[PDB]
Amino acid sequence: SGEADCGLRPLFEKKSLEDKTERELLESYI
Amino acid sequence: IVEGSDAEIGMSPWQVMLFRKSPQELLCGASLISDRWVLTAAHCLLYPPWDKNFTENDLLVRIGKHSRTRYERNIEKISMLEKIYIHPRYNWRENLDRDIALMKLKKPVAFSDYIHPVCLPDRETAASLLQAGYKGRVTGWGNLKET
Amino acid sequence: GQPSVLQVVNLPIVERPVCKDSTRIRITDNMFCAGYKPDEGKRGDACEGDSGGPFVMKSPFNNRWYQMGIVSWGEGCDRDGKYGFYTHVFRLKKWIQKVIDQFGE
Amino acid sequence: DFEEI
Numbered sequence A: 001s002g003e004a005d006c007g008l009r010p011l012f013e014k015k016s017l018e019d020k021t022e023r024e025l026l027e028s029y030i
Numbered sequence B: 001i002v003e004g005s006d007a008e009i010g011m012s013p014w015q016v017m018l019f020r021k022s023p024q025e026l027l028c029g030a031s032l033i034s035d036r037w038v039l040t041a042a043h044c045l046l047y048p049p050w051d052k053n054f055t056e057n058d059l060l061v062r063i064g065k066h067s068r069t070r071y072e073r074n075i076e077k078i079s080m081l082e083k084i085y086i087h088p089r090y091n092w093r094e095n096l097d098r099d100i101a102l103m104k105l106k107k108p109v110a111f112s113d114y115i116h117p118v119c120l121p122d123r124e125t126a127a128s129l130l131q132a133g134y135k136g137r138v139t140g141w142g143n144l145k146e147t
Numbered sequence C: 001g002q003p004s005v006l007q008v009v010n011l012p013i014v015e016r017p018v019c020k021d022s023t024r025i026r027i028t029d030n031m032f033c034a035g036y037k038p039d040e041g042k043r044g045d046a047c048e049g050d051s052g053g054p055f056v057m058k059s060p061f062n063n064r065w066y067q068m069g070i071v072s073w074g075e076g077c078d079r080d081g082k083y084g085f086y087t088h089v090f091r092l093k094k095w096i097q098k099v100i101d102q103f104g105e
Numbered sequence D: 001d002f003e004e005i
């Protein structure tokens, strides 16, 4: 849920760039 | 945040700062869910044991920030509140149960590379992700040590 | 101290039982706790000034960020065997939908 | 502590 473009960061998801620790989050989801 | 690291620019475009008009001081964090709504904890506004009970006119919302202290010209937006909504069954007397509040911005805020809304979960996202061991991320300009 | 810029910390969700057993405060379903257990050997916690901020997760299915919690309370900050408690946003979602469409844009 | 707005 949330807005039409919600949760897609202009400076990261939208340019396909990842932040320094998001991999740690994704790796915890089994 | 205790044991955290400095956020990258634009890493959390929904982070909002609750700022008191006078004394000018940081009250709490909050998040932007749409162009006109900010979600925060009800204890940030109402907490009788400590004589805390803020109204719309006592606060200012600062969006698009990185620096705690600085007035970041051309980057951050400061908005005024139109209405504050506290959950009817917010339990301040005992355990801060239903600690939630919504704040209506007086005029919609424009998105940019530094200001962008976060998504609110749906039943299915909640179910698959809210599980023991899974990591989430917290952000704030609060204390670096308890001491 | 108080930081110069915005700080971030990634924390794991803790099992409801471990949460009730770390405090004398009555836990309800509208809260969840998070942080490392003393044996995990990693630390982190929200503290004073962080209240009301977002506890977010990135969905692996659509690559978007969702706000799962709101920084609520704790007993101390980063104290071993203590955890931070957050408002369970989804359980209060109907209240959120209702004040929005009943009160505005 | 904070810069004037």
Ligand SMILES: N=C(N)NCCCNC(=O)[C@@H]1CS[C@H]2CC[C@@H](NS(=O)(=O)Cc3ccccc3)C(=O)N21
Pocket (backbone or CB within 6 Å): B043, B047, B094, B095, B096, C025, C045, C046, C047, C048, C049, C050, C051, C071, C072, C073, C074, C075, C076, C077, C078, C083, C084, C085
């Ligand atoms: N995650 C953390 N370690 N701390 C969360 C951020 C800081 N939040 C707070 O200090 C909030 C603001 S209002 C204040 C009320 C009780 C306080 N917790 S406490 O140690 O007194 C235990 C307590 C919890 C709930 C109600 C009454 C008392 C607390 O954490 N508060």
